[PDB]
Symmetry: D2
Subunit: 220 residues, 4 copies
């Protein structure tokens, strides 16, 4: 009491537009906030089949699901029950640019996610519009405070078919709903994200993430 | 050929969300497509007073309004009567990122503009959230083709209080609705945009743009 | 004060640099008309020739004194003389190539002297620079403004490539007068066009030309 | 008969120019390649006292010093005895940009390093020219292949006095001298780097780095 339980449910609704293509996607899942693990079943409700790589959406589908050790302030679990919100930009190396936001709330044992995602300027023959991506490689998010706001920057990479990589820089700004939530010091958060399964058109996808916060070398 | 008249009316509808603040803005104006001039009266219908600098929105409020000389293919006038659409990213120097789009159609003597605008990651004490902007400086858009699509990049700058400047890079991708509209060669488009007047909170704004296409030195 | 800049000036230039780990030295001798914003220069690779990279990436490094300034815009560059000024520049190419360059500019009599350095890193082996697939810079427009108390010019640039694709490069130059008391200009634009008029097969010898004109943008330009 | 020995020496010379200020700096160190730990004593031979934050130079003062696990190809240890070279760009958030190069060779138990470092466009009032930096935060370098070349991208941050942070993006390209050195798959390398001690003007500096390669979650 102690808002967050060892096992939580996850309800998510994303709406968005990439390349002028509108879509709506519902998510239903479960996770273990204290182990930093979560899974979700996603369903394209409108806009299917998506004309673009589903992978660009997957980080938009909650840093509550991250294992924080005792020596690092856990801004995210501290933000409940009132919750918090985040904004993000994704800057892909070929000019594709996405913005996204999620307003995260909690009712009982369930997190609710209102997610918006917009992508512009993706080249027609790029790996995104040609759906040539395989997965995100595991990443490390750098967490720091800027102008009063917890900020996470990430150098990300999509593995492509033919074993090339496709670079994307992510900046996320995280804001507790409640006044006064103490900001953490600089720290790192390892991520790995995986589409465990999906149908042909990616109208149905099962997503998994694992995340662990740490202080970097040599204290990790 | 185009059915674009020397004098046209402009109907505009924008919806958007900056920093989590949703808004709706209507525009009604008139322009001279062949003189590359237009003006518009904008009214904030929802979300007023805006908590952010109105200037960030104004380039989203149609390159049909640009004087094109004979020796340069005019992709925009050649796109009608069927019309065209664009997507844009605005990358501000302090991490603020916006995306925008506009679907442009024509019915008789009126252009219709369905515009969307999203902005994320603006710092609380930056010139945008603190409304320290004065105007966009006159600019020059660099037009070229990339992956089969007409693309415009601009080095933009907002004049700020005290005559400092706040930099923003714009990339716009332009796509004619009808197939096989001939793409132009590399060229430049000069722009100047100005808020001619506005009320205290910028719920009401009169906007003007002048744009002229040219080939650069030594010609221009 | 009187600039001591004549309508017809000589240009002496010395570049040294390193791109992709390849060292080079290039000399330049040219002439120009500061008030007309036009200049031409004959360049000769003295060391490291033949260059294994596109000569074009070097050409903007080969002096905003050579820009026609109208009377209503403060001319920081001509006012920097006789003492002179220096600039530093970053070039950020869309495929990861990054160059930095500097020029220290002085004047003796009818001649500008230029000590130029140029370093480029992270150009991919099969990109248009290492493969020498560039044709020219397209005409550009430099945005001039005071940033952190220093006149700065930002530019969206584009190299035409063979196959008529374009290759994007963003430029930022910082310009600093050597002498105190040089008035800073308000925001303005400088149109450029730069052209290799001729070259020998390996670009060991190159004739370069530039035309530049400052203006206030629309609606009065 | 291995080229890499458990305890090795490091001889280094850097020459460079930041904001027009020329400098020469010699380094003499020792390290343990297999444990990814090294220390070096640096001495400014020319250009002291440096007018800029010594911290911008420290990553330029060899990925052979990284603990590589068996399941990740170790490109750097495989590059000896002949050696390898790297080029780097450092893009700071306020427009300061640096490039650096190191040509690394080996004789007996000693690595030799020919290092060059050039920085431009640092603002006079910024934390580099004001010497307001305290340290690099621990980081994670993302290693991947692009156009045949091992490439490392890093989201870096300098902690500043007052506990603000100053962001810098690093790209390094690494090239074995010898033909036929096998490229590794995608992986991460954790770093931490620390000035253990220095005299008042940073004419003398003792530097330490620890680095460890890993596969990220869930392995790590
Ligand atoms: O937790 S990872 O295997 O997507
Ligand atoms: O089109 S300009 O005169 O604001
Ligand atoms: O005057 S320009 O075509 O070098
Ligand atoms: O080199 S590490 O101990 O910050």
């Amino acid at each position: 009491m102690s808002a967050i339980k060892p096992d939580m449910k996850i309800n998510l609704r994303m709406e968005g537009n990439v390349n002028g293509h509108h879509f709506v996607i519902d998510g239903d899942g479960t996770g273990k906030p204290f182990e930093g693990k979560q899974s979700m079943d996603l369903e394209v409700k409108e806009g299917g089949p998506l004309p673009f790589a589903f992978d660009i959406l997957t980080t938009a589908f909650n840093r509550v699901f991250a294992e924080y050790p005792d020596h690092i302030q856990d801004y995210f679990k501290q933000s409940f029950p009132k919750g918090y919100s985040w904004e993000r930009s994704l800057t892909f190396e070929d000019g594709g640019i996405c913005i996204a936001r999620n307003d995260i709330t909690m009712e009982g044992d369930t997190f609710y996610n209102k997610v918006r995602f917009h992508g512009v300027n993706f080249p027609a023959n790029g790996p995104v519009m040609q759906k040539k991506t395989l997965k995100w490689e595991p990443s490390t998010e750098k967490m720091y405070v800027r102008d009063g706001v917890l900020t996470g920057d990430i150098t990300m990479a999509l593995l492509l078919e033919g074993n090339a990589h496709y670079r994307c820089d992510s900046r996320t700004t995280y804001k507790a709903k409640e006044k006064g939530v103490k900001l953490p010091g600089y720290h790192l958060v390892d991520h790995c994200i995986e589409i465990l399964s999906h149908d042909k058109d990616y109208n149905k996808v099962k997503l998994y993430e694992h995340a662990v916060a740490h202080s970097g070398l040599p204290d990790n």
